[PDB]
Amino acid sequence: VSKETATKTRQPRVQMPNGLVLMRMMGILWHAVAGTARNPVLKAFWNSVPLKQATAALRKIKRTVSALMVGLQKRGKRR
Amino acid sequence: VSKETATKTRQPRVQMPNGLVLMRMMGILWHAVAGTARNPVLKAFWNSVPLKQATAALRKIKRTVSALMVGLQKRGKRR
């Protein structure tokens, strides 16, 4: 549920599947470095983030975002 | 100065340099879908934002952030 994902993002006890948490970790860090947001339990999990497994997601999820970006451009001109 | 940029994130009159404003657009836009925070300044910038040229610039930065993670791995084990 997208409505749920939006609520779970930046919410205490973000203990969810690895494939889901690793899809929000960098998002939070993006604003954490230059902005705000620093939850105790979040920090603990972040300090426990694997090395190789992190890069594996970095080179995967980011590609999908790029694919969709160009994908929508293919349907920019209809009719 | 991260402390200086921090208070500029999601702040009105965010007329930052090309590479700087893009970094903000690649952050707040994500939160706008997974939460909230939709400033007219960003909406206007995104409205007139390039399509084909965007993917290229974004991918360029996507590499750097991922390279940093791998770079830290080479310094995870000190002595």
mmCIF file of C-alpha atoms in Angstrom:
data_model
loop_
_atom_site.group_PDB
_atom_site.id
_atom_site.type_symbol
_atom_site.label_atom_id
_atom_site.label_comp_id
_atom_site.label_asym_id
_atom_site.label_seq_id
_atom_site.Cartn_x
_atom_site.Cartn_y
_atom_site.Cartn_z
ATOM 1 C CA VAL A 1 0.000 0.000 0.000
ATOM 2 C CA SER A 2 1.581 3.252 -1.211
ATOM 3 C CA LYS A 3 -0.405 5.102 1.452
ATOM 4 C CA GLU A 4 1.248 2.875 4.046
ATOM 5 C CA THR A 5 4.755 3.213 2.607
ATOM 6 C CA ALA A 6 4.387 6.996 2.753
ATOM 7 C CA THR A 7 3.465 6.783 6.438
ATOM 8 C CA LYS A 8 6.169 4.244 7.287
ATOM 9 C CA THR A 9 8.791 6.513 5.745
ATOM 10 C CA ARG A 10 10.471 8.474 8.555
ATOM 11 C CA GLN A 11 8.526 6.656 11.273
ATOM 12 C CA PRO A 12 9.850 5.110 14.541
ATOM 13 C CA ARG A 13 10.525 1.359 14.476
ATOM 14 C CA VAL A 14 11.213 1.173 10.744
ATOM 15 C CA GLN A 15 12.115 -2.494 11.224
ATOM 16 C CA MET A 16 10.935 -3.952 7.923
ATOM 17 C CA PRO A 17 12.316 -6.409 5.269
ATOM 18 C CA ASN A 18 15.919 -5.735 4.172
ATOM 19 C CA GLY A 19 14.790 -5.003 0.624
ATOM 20 C CA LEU A 20 12.450 -2.344 1.979
ATOM 21 C CA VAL A 21 14.603 -0.738 4.677
ATOM 22 C CA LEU A 22 17.537 -0.391 2.263
ATOM 23 C CA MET A 23 15.162 1.502 -0.011
ATOM 24 C CA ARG A 24 14.590 4.178 2.635
ATOM 25 C CA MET A 25 17.924 4.275 4.475
ATOM 26 C CA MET A 26 19.656 6.402 1.830
ATOM 27 C CA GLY A 27 16.537 8.522 1.480
ATOM 28 C CA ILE A 28 16.605 9.454 5.153
ATOM 29 C CA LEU A 29 20.379 9.981 5.055
ATOM 30 C CA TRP A 30 19.868 12.339 2.102
ATOM 31 C CA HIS A 31 18.037 14.762 4.392
ATOM 32 C CA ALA A 32 19.871 13.704 7.551
ATOM 33 C CA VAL A 33 23.204 14.994 6.241
ATOM 34 C CA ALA A 34 21.794 18.342 5.121
ATOM 35 C CA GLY A 35 18.563 19.005 6.965
ATOM 36 C CA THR A 36 17.362 17.097 10.019
ATOM 37 C CA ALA A 37 15.927 13.766 11.288
ATOM 38 C CA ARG A 38 18.001 11.505 13.548
ATOM 39 C CA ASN A 39 16.079 8.732 15.300
ATOM 40 C CA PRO A 40 17.932 6.628 17.943
ATOM 41 C CA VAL A 41 16.648 3.258 16.692
ATOM 42 C CA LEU A 42 17.187 4.418 13.114
ATOM 43 C CA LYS A 43 20.794 5.345 13.843
ATOM 44 C CA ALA A 44 21.418 1.936 15.420
ATOM 45 C CA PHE A 45 20.192 0.110 12.324
ATOM 46 C CA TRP A 46 22.125 2.487 10.070
ATOM 47 C CA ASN A 47 25.300 1.712 12.012
ATOM 48 C CA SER A 48 24.576 -1.955 11.347
ATOM 49 C CA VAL A 49 24.146 -1.574 7.577
ATOM 50 C CA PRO A 50 26.275 -4.123 5.621
ATOM 51 C CA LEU A 51 28.959 -2.949 3.190
ATOM 52 C CA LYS A 52 28.730 -5.108 0.063
ATOM 53 C CA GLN A 53 24.964 -5.556 0.413
ATOM 54 C CA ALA A 54 24.534 -1.777 0.475
ATOM 55 C CA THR A 55 26.406 -1.187 -2.785
ATOM 56 C CA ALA A 56 24.371 -4.017 -4.328
ATOM 57 C CA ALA A 57 21.230 -1.994 -3.696
ATOM 58 C CA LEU A 58 22.847 1.311 -4.679
ATOM 59 C CA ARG A 59 23.623 0.070 -8.179
ATOM 60 C CA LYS A 60 20.170 -1.512 -8.534
ATOM 61 C CA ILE A 61 17.458 0.780 -7.138
ATOM 62 C CA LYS A 62 19.035 3.890 -8.659
ATOM 63 C CA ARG A 63 18.912 2.267 -12.087
ATOM 64 C CA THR A 64 15.168 1.711 -11.784
ATOM 65 C CA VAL A 65 14.655 5.400 -10.992
ATOM 66 C CA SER A 66 16.595 6.274 -14.136
ATOM 67 C CA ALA A 67 14.666 3.710 -16.181
ATOM 68 C CA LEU A 68 11.326 5.154 -15.098
ATOM 69 C CA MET A 69 12.558 8.688 -15.784
ATOM 70 C CA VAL A 70 13.309 7.870 -19.420
ATOM 71 C CA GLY A 71 10.363 5.483 -19.552
ATOM 72 C CA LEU A 72 7.863 8.243 -18.851
ATOM 73 C CA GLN A 73 9.508 10.294 -21.592
ATOM 74 C CA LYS A 74 8.531 7.566 -24.052
ATOM 75 C CA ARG A 75 4.884 8.178 -23.193
ATOM 76 C CA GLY A 76 5.194 11.943 -23.009
ATOM 77 C CA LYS A 77 3.647 12.392 -26.439
ATOM 78 C CA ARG A 78 0.379 10.511 -26.826
ATOM 79 C CA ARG A 79 -2.069 10.607 -29.754
ATOM 80 C CA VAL B 1 29.644 23.822 5.311
ATOM 81 C CA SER B 2 26.968 21.164 5.831
ATOM 82 C CA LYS B 3 25.506 23.300 8.618
ATOM 83 C CA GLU B 4 24.903 26.083 6.091
ATOM 84 C CA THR B 5 23.345 23.843 3.454
ATOM 85 C CA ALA B 6 21.204 22.068 6.061
ATOM 86 C CA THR B 7 19.112 25.167 6.801
ATOM 87 C CA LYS B 8 18.725 25.758 3.057
ATOM 88 C CA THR B 9 17.096 22.404 2.340
ATOM 89 C CA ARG B 10 13.328 22.723 1.768
ATOM 90 C CA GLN B 11 13.659 26.436 2.462
ATOM 91 C CA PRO B 12 11.985 29.200 0.372
ATOM 92 C CA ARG B 13 14.076 31.075 -2.211
ATOM 93 C CA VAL B 14 16.131 27.932 -2.777
ATOM 94 C CA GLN B 15 17.849 29.434 -5.822
ATOM 95 C CA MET B 16 21.012 27.374 -5.408
ATOM 96 C CA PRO B 17 23.657 26.564 -8.094
ATOM 97 C CA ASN B 18 22.852 24.003 -10.804
ATOM 98 C CA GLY B 19 24.536 21.041 -9.115
ATOM 99 C CA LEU B 20 23.268 22.142 -5.706
ATOM 100 C CA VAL B 21 19.615 22.675 -6.653
ATOM 101 C CA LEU B 22 19.555 19.321 -8.460
ATOM 102 C CA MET B 23 20.698 17.607 -5.260
ATOM 103 C CA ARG B 24 17.748 19.159 -3.459
ATOM 104 C CA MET B 25 15.343 18.183 -6.226
ATOM 105 C CA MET B 26 16.655 14.620 -5.981
ATOM 106 C CA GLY B 27 15.727 14.595 -2.319
ATOM 107 C CA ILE B 28 12.610 16.611 -1.532
ATOM 108 C CA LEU B 29 10.797 15.244 -4.601
ATOM 109 C CA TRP B 30 11.189 11.776 -3.109
ATOM 110 C CA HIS B 31 9.856 12.872 0.277
ATOM 111 C CA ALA B 32 6.915 14.586 -1.420
ATOM 112 C CA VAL B 33 5.790 11.144 -2.585
ATOM 113 C CA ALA B 34 6.776 9.289 0.590
ATOM 114 C CA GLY B 35 5.362 11.896 2.938
ATOM 115 C CA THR B 36 4.961 15.595 2.226
ATOM 116 C CA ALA B 37 6.847 18.885 1.607
ATOM 117 C CA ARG B 38 5.898 20.450 -1.709
ATOM 118 C CA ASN B 39 7.207 23.984 -2.211
ATOM 119 C CA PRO B 40 6.121 26.009 -5.302
ATOM 120 C CA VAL B 41 9.766 26.921 -5.954
ATOM 121 C CA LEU B 42 10.637 23.258 -6.478
ATOM 122 C CA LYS B 43 7.417 22.587 -8.383
ATOM 123 C CA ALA B 44 8.235 25.353 -10.855
ATOM 124 C CA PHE B 45 11.830 24.189 -11.231
ATOM 125 C CA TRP B 46 10.658 20.608 -11.814
ATOM 126 C CA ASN B 47 8.064 21.828 -14.317
ATOM 127 C CA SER B 48 10.775 23.421 -16.442
ATOM 128 C CA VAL B 49 13.277 20.666 -15.638
ATOM 129 C CA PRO B 50 14.888 18.873 -18.640
ATOM 130 C CA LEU B 51 14.087 15.238 -19.392
ATOM 131 C CA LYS B 52 16.854 13.564 -21.394
ATOM 132 C CA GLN B 53 19.532 15.802 -19.876
ATOM 133 C CA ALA B 54 18.219 15.071 -16.382
ATOM 134 C CA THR B 55 18.838 11.318 -16.463
ATOM 135 C CA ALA B 56 22.456 11.913 -17.499
ATOM 136 C CA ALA B 57 23.159 14.439 -14.743
ATOM 137 C CA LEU B 58 21.363 12.339 -12.134
ATOM 138 C CA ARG B 59 23.233 9.156 -13.097
ATOM 139 C CA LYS B 60 26.475 11.113 -12.775
ATOM 140 C CA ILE B 61 25.735 11.927 -9.132
ATOM 141 C CA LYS B 62 24.281 8.463 -8.486
ATOM 142 C CA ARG B 63 27.733 7.072 -9.223
ATOM 143 C CA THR B 64 29.501 9.387 -6.764
ATOM 144 C CA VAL B 65 27.230 8.570 -3.799
ATOM 145 C CA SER B 66 27.638 4.851 -4.477
ATOM 146 C CA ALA B 67 31.403 5.166 -4.959
ATOM 147 C CA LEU B 68 31.629 6.819 -1.547
ATOM 148 C CA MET B 69 30.054 3.764 0.088
ATOM 149 C CA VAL B 70 32.598 1.476 -1.564
ATOM 150 C CA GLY B 71 35.413 3.874 -0.720
ATOM 151 C CA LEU B 72 34.537 3.720 2.970
ATOM 152 C CA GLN B 73 34.736 -0.075 2.798
ATOM 153 C CA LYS B 74 38.440 0.232 1.988
ATOM 154 C CA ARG B 75 38.913 2.063 5.276
ATOM 155 C CA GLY B 76 36.564 0.010 7.427
ATOM 156 C CA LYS B 77 39.399 -2.121 8.755
ATOM 157 C CA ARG B 78 42.102 0.103 10.214
ATOM 158 C CA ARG B 79 45.315 -1.697 11.181
#
